[PDB]
Amino acid sequence: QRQDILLNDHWNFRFSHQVQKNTEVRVDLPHTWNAQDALSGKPDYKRGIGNYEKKLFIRSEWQGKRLFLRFEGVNSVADVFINNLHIGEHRGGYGAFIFEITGKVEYGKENSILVRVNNGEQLDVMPLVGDFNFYGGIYRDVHLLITDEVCISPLDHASPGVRLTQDSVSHKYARIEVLVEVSNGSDKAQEIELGICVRDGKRTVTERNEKFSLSGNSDMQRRLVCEIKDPHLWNGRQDPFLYRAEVTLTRDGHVIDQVTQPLGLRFYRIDPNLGFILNGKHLPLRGVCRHQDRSEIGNALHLQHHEEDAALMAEMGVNAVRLAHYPQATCFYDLMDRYGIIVWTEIPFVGPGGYMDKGFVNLPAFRSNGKEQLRELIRQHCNHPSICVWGLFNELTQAGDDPTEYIEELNRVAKQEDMTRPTTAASNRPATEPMNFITDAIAWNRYDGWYGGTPSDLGKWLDDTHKKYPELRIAVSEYGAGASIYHQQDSLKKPEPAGWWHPENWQTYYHAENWKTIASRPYLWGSFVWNMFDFGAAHRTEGDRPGINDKGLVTFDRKVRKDAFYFYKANWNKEEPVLYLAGRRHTVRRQRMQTIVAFTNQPEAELFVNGRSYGKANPDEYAVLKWQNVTLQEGENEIQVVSKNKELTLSDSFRCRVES
Amino acid sequence: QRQDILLNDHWNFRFSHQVQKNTEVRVDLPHTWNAQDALSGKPDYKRGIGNYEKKLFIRSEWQGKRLFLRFEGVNSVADVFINNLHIGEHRGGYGAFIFEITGKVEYGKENSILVRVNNGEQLDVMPLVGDFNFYGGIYRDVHLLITDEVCISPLDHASPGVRLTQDSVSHKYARIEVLVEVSNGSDKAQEIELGICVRDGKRTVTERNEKFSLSGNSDMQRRLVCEIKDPHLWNGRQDPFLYRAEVTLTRDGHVIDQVTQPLGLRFYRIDPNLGFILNGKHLPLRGVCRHQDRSEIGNALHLQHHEEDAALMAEMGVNAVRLAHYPQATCFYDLMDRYGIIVWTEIPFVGPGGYMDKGFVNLPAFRSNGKEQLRELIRQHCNHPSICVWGLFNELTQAGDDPTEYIEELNRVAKQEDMTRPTTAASNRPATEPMNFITDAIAWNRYDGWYGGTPSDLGKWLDDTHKKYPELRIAVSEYGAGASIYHQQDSLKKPEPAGWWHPENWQTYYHAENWKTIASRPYLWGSFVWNMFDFGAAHRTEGDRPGINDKGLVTFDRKVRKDAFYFYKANWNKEEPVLYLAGRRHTVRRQRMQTIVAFTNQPEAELFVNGRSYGKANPDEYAVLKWQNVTLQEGENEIQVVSKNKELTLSDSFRCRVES
Ligand SMILES: [Cl-]
Ligand SMILES: [Cl-]
Structure with a gap:
């Protein structure tokens, strides 16, 4: 029902330091303008304002819905314009952020999205220093959200509008509390049905829904509660099990808006x-x-x-x-x-x-x-x-x-x-x-x-x-x-x-x-x-x-x-x-006698140097196989390590040369 | 008994535009100084002179032998110095070149090689223009060659000193004319024996040998002609057979120098x-x-x-x-x-x-x-x-x-x-x-x-x-x-x-x-x-x-x-x-109707769209599978192709999203 449209394709860009007209160039999101200067080792790479413009046709049928521009990342500071009128500023290079453009567009027409991004230095936006690159730009995806005038709100800190909190988690029971932002953007008071369904694939595990009234141009929060007995726990890599939790708004039957989120229960x-x-x-x-x-x-x-x-x-x-x-x-x-x-x-x-x-x-x-x-x-x-x-x-x-x-x-x-x-x-x-x-x-x-x-x-x-x-x-x-x-x-x-x-x-x-x-x-x-x-x-x-x-x-x-x-x-x-010789990239050696090292999770491996065995050995406590005093010969050598464990026979080898 | 020693380790490097006394940094060959600026898309990347300096201990035991520095590639124009005295220049960035240093070095002591390299523009050293990068530096290996005073010369245009000319090749018979550059660096004339031994693995296919006297401080070019009945022809990728051809110098029954070269016979x-x-x-x-x-x-x-x-x-x-x-x-x-x-x-x-x-x-x-x-x-x-x-x-x-x-x-x-x-x-x-x-x-x-x-x-x-x-x-x-x-x-x-x-x-x-x-x-x-x-x-x-x-x-x-x-x-x-779906990187599509295309070398293959089979198809003369009028779903699809030719079942698949 609710629509999520990717807006990455075909933007125009220029640096504010390109002050002349007709200097824009096509970019395609995601995008940073420091992928060349910073990566080349220039410590004074470009930190300042870049200007992204998109033309977006606002459909007539979209009038009467609610329209949002969600940005998943823009480093560092962003100012957003619709048809060149400022709609908002966001300071911070790594959280997502959002703006409602329902009241700001001309329905049935092209409209202008303008994002003025700054990654220049500031003393008031963390991070201030760091041993990494502060790549400037719209470097993550950009989406147009279209929802019903009554919706599960995406506006609260650009969260999903659904927040799933876990307490009392045990192998026998778990309690999940579900905080929902609901927003009525209509001028009319609405009687809606709010529901939560927690699923294992397509099997409902728990379910609660609730009918309530919400006045026009008003939003409130709802906190539902449900329980699961003998929950399937999320247990790291042993068993990363995941419920999907679906929260829906309903009105006169039929769903009007929907948000789904993961639920992994663990203590x-x-x-x-x-x-x-x-x-x-x-x-x-x-x-x-x-x-x-x-x-x-x-x-x-x-x-x-x-x-x-x-x-x-x-x-x-x-x-x-x-x-x-x-x-x-x-x-x-x-x-x-x-x-x-x-x-x-x-x-x-x-x-x-x-x-x-x-x-x-x-x-x-x-x-x-x-x-x-x-x-x-x-x-x-x-x-x-x-x-x-x-x-x-x-x-x-x-x-x-x-x-x-x-x-x-x-x-x-x-x-x-x-x-x-x-x-x-x-x-x-x-x-x-x-x-x-x-x-x-x-x-x-x-x-x-x-x-x-x-x-x-x-x-x-x-x-x-x-x-x-x-x-x-x-x-x-x-x-x-x-x-x-x-x-x-x-x-x-x-x-x-x-x-x-x-x-x-x-x-x-x-x-x-x-x-x-x-x-x-x-x-x-x-x-x-x-x-x-x-x-x-x-x-x-x-x-x-x-x-x-x-x-x-x-x-x-x-x-x-x-x-x-x-x-x-x-x-x-x-x-x-795993059976892996170390030092395969040391291919020109100056010694004849070496220490050879491999890594394995097998019980036993045997080293071969120009076909000549140097013995079986077992890894130590930390998977290390080691043969000291291995005499190589001048010029070319071949070094192979082999392991057998029932049907499992493994092998690794590399070549190298000794000069002097 | 010939010696070949890599000199790529730890050189000192500085540009001549760095005028100050201690601006040298460590490099390790192969080296270019345009790895960062040119590949960053800077059209005016550094084109000019850089300087490499290597300290080499010249063994006392090397006096009485001959010593060569062979550069496999220095872009563009090189000037080599020993102990800061000029010993030669090479103009050209892509051919090997060599300089004998036998008489330029102080034996038993540490000596210094300096290589001044220029890739600055010139109008007299091809290539003058080109859709590519003129990366300056010693971007290929550098070898120190140590040979007997009488040797198979490596001096003639940095050649191997052995030229294998295939003057007549057939399925029944092959004649190969071998030219060997010999050099007597000593000041006494010398009786040597010249040998060429053409081998298939360890087996001697042909051998040819000759004796002569060569005078001191003297070069001459020997020619030996070899035949091979019913030769094993290098026949491209069907059978890239290669004979080994080893050339030896012998003096009083002992081998004093050898160079081996590949020989593949074909017409x-x-x-x-x-x-x-x-x-x-x-x-x-x-x-x-x-x-x-x-x-x-x-x-x-x-x-x-x-x-x-x-x-x-x-x-x-x-x-x-x-x-x-x-x-x-x-x-x-x-x-x-x-x-x-x-x-x-x-x-x-x-x-x-x-x-x-x-x-x-x-x-x-x-x-x-x-x-x-x-x-x-x-x-x-x-x-x-x-x-x-x-x-x-x-x-x-x-x-x-x-x-x-x-x-x-x-x-x-x-x-x-x-x-x-x-x-x-x-x-x-x-x-x-x-x-x-x-x-x-x-x-x-x-x-x-x-x-x-x-x-x-x-x-x-x-x-x-x-x-x-x-x-x-x-x-x-x-x-x-x-x-x-x-x-x-x-x-x-x-x-x-x-x-x-x-x-x-x-x-x-x-x-x-x-x-x-x-x-x-x-x-x-x-x-x-x-x-x-x-x-x-x-x-x-x-x-x-x-x-x-x-x-x-x-x-x-x-x-x-x-x-x-x-x-x-x-x-x-x-x-x-080969069974390869085309388009796998086009993950966000705007149109539900598609033409699905795949490449295979298998007889036939079946397309599945969300588990729905679009029937088997056959490659065209140019290995193209094509399914017209493929209907995708709004939202996520999965596209998979399968081929079975028992005993062989192949599969390829990818995920895209449709979003009108
Ligand atoms: Cl601090
Ligand atoms: Cl021309």
């Missing part, structure tokens, strides 16, 4: 000594971090790109994700729902880390806008079963303008919006700083063995902190190491992090030792690898090219899994057979 | 009416072109990039390739040797096409340099069996400085170097121009149905040219149409080539019509798709991003095969099963 708690308990059973959060960009296109992502990023994490055995450092797309939360991957999602309250300036500036506009951004985050995505914590900052400092007061304010805003999920944060503060003690959970970013030290520093630090504050729920927000797939060398030696040489073997070593450190500590409720993918950061000058943070387990184009990916796949994915 | 001819005939059988040349670049790295390619490029053509059923527009890597020629893919390779005498300026400036240095580039091509790559024609130019114009005489000179030079291979060229000249009649075979670049006109124009023009000049050997050297994989619509509609809109469905239509035209004309000895892959051309402003020529059948990162790829693969690859 869980974060235990200071046991970690994360999902539906009564402990669950390691084997996590990675993910940014929303890609090679060549920046953050103008299409559906298939989200799907592919999800598939690669699923393949590696990921069961948790931190979506850094901002609200991300509905269809990615969808995929995490459907795969059973637990989600940490946060507002863009990002501090400087090792860089300059601040993530917090004590401006009324900044503080206020931040609260609206956190309110957008929760109201737009709270229905997703995969979301399990709400994150409030990444790497703020207490020096200069101190955000501790404001963070406490944000924490309270989160609880007003959602009591059912803990808050968390990603800190790089000494443990004594108050801001580590506000959120329900806390976590630190740690690079022991990359930005200085050795991996053993990590377990000591975490052990000490867990001892001094026994009630903290500690996790590793970030840990990782740079790696170019074209940087190879025989020996493990710690590269300079800020230089043009990130040899792949050190990333491998780093994650091996670090996962060992994490896996020995059950008090950590999760760990999150920085990062799943290389991602654009235009100011970086390191690795094999500028403009890239190269700590991904997979390359920026999603083409090449680095060695470390297969290390995590050996450990985390016990379903697909 | 062929180009018939004006019959096309290309390989070892007696007519072979249609199913061909594509290929530039030597790739996303993110530019032309600084590694071996795996070459290998993947070649696997992609092989998968598609390519059997011929035009390497445009310049001499390419030995590594890649070796792949075509092994795959059986016939190779057209050309010097970079490239004209302006639809752009400005000139391929040819009548300067004496331009002319002599061109002759040296053509000698480098033939002498370096002559041994590769896959190479079958030599190209002399691409889209020169007779207006202004007329190159026609100079082309006659070039043709003469080619024949001085190789009487076993015909010469060809790629013209955009009306057939009446004399420059179409110099080379033995000719070919035109035609874009009928992209740069104006319809595809059927192509056959009309071909047939007419064929009829007027019945002794010309005509091929189609380019034909193509751009496509973005992100640009989709419902109707076939000719886009504007220079505009920001290249819908994928036109390229599909274009190649299906032009293959039909080409496939019907046996007088075309070959046809070459422009292009196998999207490639860098900074000046370009079309498709979905600037700086890209998007006529590739496969995208610039080699991740996504466009629809047309599968059209060729269904026609050309008959060994792997």
Whole structure:
């Protein structure tokens, strides 16, 4: 009944700095204008105003309906015009936002949609700093909504208008409360029927409907309640079961409007000594971090790109994700729902880390806008079963303008919006700083063995902190190491992090030792690898090219899994057979005697070097096969590893050459 | 006992516009400095001088041996220095070159190689213009060669020092004339023995040997003639058999130097009416072109990039390739040797096409340099069996400085170097121009149905040219149409080539019509798709991003095969099963009525639309399955095709949305 029309095709664009006429060029949404300058490594890429114009014919039959323009993302600040009259402004690059254009168009005519987008710097719109790209543009989809004059309202913070809250969840019973925004845009009072039907496919599981009166040009909220006995729980990747919940408005029979949403029922708690308990059973959060960009296109992502990023994490055995450092797309939360991957999602309250300036500036506009951004985050995505914590900052400092007061304010805003999920944060503060003690959970970013030290520093630090504050729920927000797939060398030696040489073997070593450190500590409720993918950061000058943070387990184009990916796949994915030699891309070696390493989830593998066996071996606790003192021969070599397990015979091999 | 040592590791690099004392950064060859600016679509990318400096310890134990630095490719003009003294210059960006440093180095001590590289514009070093990128730098490997003082010389145009000329080849008998460059670098005359041993695996097919004395500080060119009764012919992709031919130098019973080269025996001819005939059988040349670049790295390619490029053509059923527009890597020629893919390779005498300026400036240095580039091509790559024609130019114009005489000179030079291979060229000249009649075979670049006109124009023009000049050997050297994989619509509609809109469905239509035209004309000895892959051309402003020529059948990162790829693969690859729905990336459609099209090499296949069967169908002569008047649903559809040929059931499917 209700209509949702994609508006991405054929816009006109120009930069306000192109001040002459006839300078517009065709673009097609999604779109950023920084996919070339920023990705090329230019730190001063284009940050300012871009102008999108669309011609949209408003049909006559649409008069008497209600028309909305929903934007799923526009970085950073957007001003919307209909036939060149301002209708609204939205400040924030990552929440969806909406405007009703029912009273603003000429029915039966072409009309003009004009979106003036600014991604230039501000001190009053988070994020203010960050180790990533602030791609400017309409980089997510744009939709025309047409509904009945009486509808389930899409206007409240661009939420769906249906909000599904879970309490009393057990293996035996669950209670769901359903908050519905209903809007009467007619001049007449209406007697409507409101109904909720929760379904398993096409089988009704529960159902309640309600008749009530609503005056003209008025909206009110309705909160229905229903129950499910012996509910089918959403249980992570073991069984990511999903009800669909349909809320309908009815009038004289026949549906007049409909909204459907996912319902995944789960209970869980974060235990200071046991970690994360999902539906009564402990669950390691084997996590990675993910940014929303890609090679060549920046953050103008299409559906298939989200799907592919999800598939690669699923393949590696990921069961948790931190979506850094901002609200991300509905269809990615969808995929995490459907795969059973637990989600940490946060507002863009990002501090400087090792860089300059601040993530917090004590401006009324900044503080206020931040609260609206956190309110957008929760109201737009709270229905997703995969979301399990709400994150409030990444790497703020207490020096200069101190955000501790404001963070406490944000924490309270989160609880007003959602009591059912803990808050968390990603800190790089000494443990004594108050801001580590506000959120329900806390976590630190740690690079022991990359930005200085050795991996053993990590377990000591975490052990000490867990001892001094026994009630903290500690996790590793970030840990990782740079790696170019074209940087190879025989020996493990710690590269300079800020230089043009990130040899792949050190990333491998780093994650091996670090996962060992994490896996020995059950008090950590999760760990999150920085990062799943290389991602654009235009100011970086390191690795094999500028403009890239190269700590991904997979390359920026999603083409090449680095060695470390297969290390995590050996450990985390016990379903697909894995047998993978490390260092296949080290193809020109200077030593004759080497240490060979493979990763497997098989019980046993045997190494062969020019057909000459070097023995069977079993992986250690963390899936690592290792043969020291393997003599290669001058010139060409072939290195093959083989494993048999009943009918399952696996093989991996590569070639290489030794010079001197 | 000969030594070959890669020098790609850790060079110091700085531009000469960086004037200050410590501005050097680390690079690792292969290297270009235009990986970021040119591929970003900046038309004025850095064209000028950069400087590479390498410190090399010259072993004490190397005195008494000879030492060579061989560069496989430095774009454009190189100046090599040892210990900051000048030792030579090379003008040309695409041919190997070598410099002996035996007498320039201080033995037992650390020595410094400096390479000053210039890709700034010149009017006297082809190529002067071109629809592609002039990536500066040492973008190919650098080798230090260490040989006995008496050696098989690597000095003559950086050749291998062994030329295998096939002077008479048949199914019964083959004569091969071997020319070996020998050099006595010592100051005493020397009695050496020369050996050539032609092997099939470990088996000696023929051997030939001779003794002589050579004087000190002296070179001479030895010729040995070999026969092979009933030779095993390199027969393209049906049987790309390769003999190994190893050349040894011997002194007092011991081998002191060796160079091994590939030998594939074949005979062929180009018939004006019959096309290309390989070892007696007519072979249609199913061909594509290929530039030597790739996303993110530019032309600084590694071996795996070459290998993947070649696997992609092989998968598609390519059997011929035009390497445009310049001499390419030995590594890649070796792949075509092994795959059986016939190779057209050309010097970079490239004209302006639809752009400005000139391929040819009548300067004496331009002319002599061109002759040296053509000698480098033939002498370096002559041994590769896959190479079958030599190209002399691409889209020169007779207006202004007329190159026609100079082309006659070039043709003469080619024949001085190789009487076993015909010469060809790629013209955009009306057939009446004399420059179409110099080379033995000719070919035109035609874009009928992209740069104006319809595809059927192509056959009309071909047939007419064929009829007027019945002794010309005509091929189609380019034909193509751009496509973005992100640009989709419902109707076939000719886009504007220079505009920001290249819908994928036109390229599909274009190649299906032009293959039909080409496939019907046996007088075309070959046809070459422009292009196998999207490639860098900074000046370009079309498709979905600037700086890209998007006529590739496969995208610039080699991740996504466009629809047309599968059209060729269904026609050309008959060994792997193909069942491929066209249009899968057109996910949002505006019209419920559709024509569903699929490519297959299977006998028949059944279309299902939302489980509803639209009956079985058969491919056409060009492997196209088509179902007319297919009726889709509003909202989500699913489209699936199935083929069974027991024992083989194949399936392909995709999801789109209809939204009027
Ligand atoms: Cl801060
Ligand atoms: Cl010219």
